[PDB]
Amino acid sequence: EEDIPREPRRIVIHRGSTGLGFNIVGGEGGEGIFISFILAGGPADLSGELRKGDQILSVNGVDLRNASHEQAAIALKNAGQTVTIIAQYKPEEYSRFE
Structure with a gap:
């Protein structure tokens, strides 16, 4: 994770037979x-x-x-x-909630 920046970043993914290949949590509180x-x-x-x-x-x-x-x-x-996903890496906040 040495190369992941603090600010939002752009990432292009192509959908396949298993979707985009990730699952999500959150969207509450x-x-x-x-x-x-x-x-x-x-x-x-x-x-x-x-x-x-x-x-x-x-x-x-x-x-x-x-x-x-x-x-x-x-x-x-x-x-x-x-x-095209705009993502922002927030591992400490993630751990706080999850």
């Missing part, structure tokens, strides 16, 4: 949408850029900063084959 799980060999893993503890801020221009979990899952499912 003080907790935004966080990646909780990255599937080995799936797209997010292959890319090598996303991490457990990333907050998802936007998906293809759909703002998820204040989305509920279901709003985020719908946005992710409907974002098409090529998906």
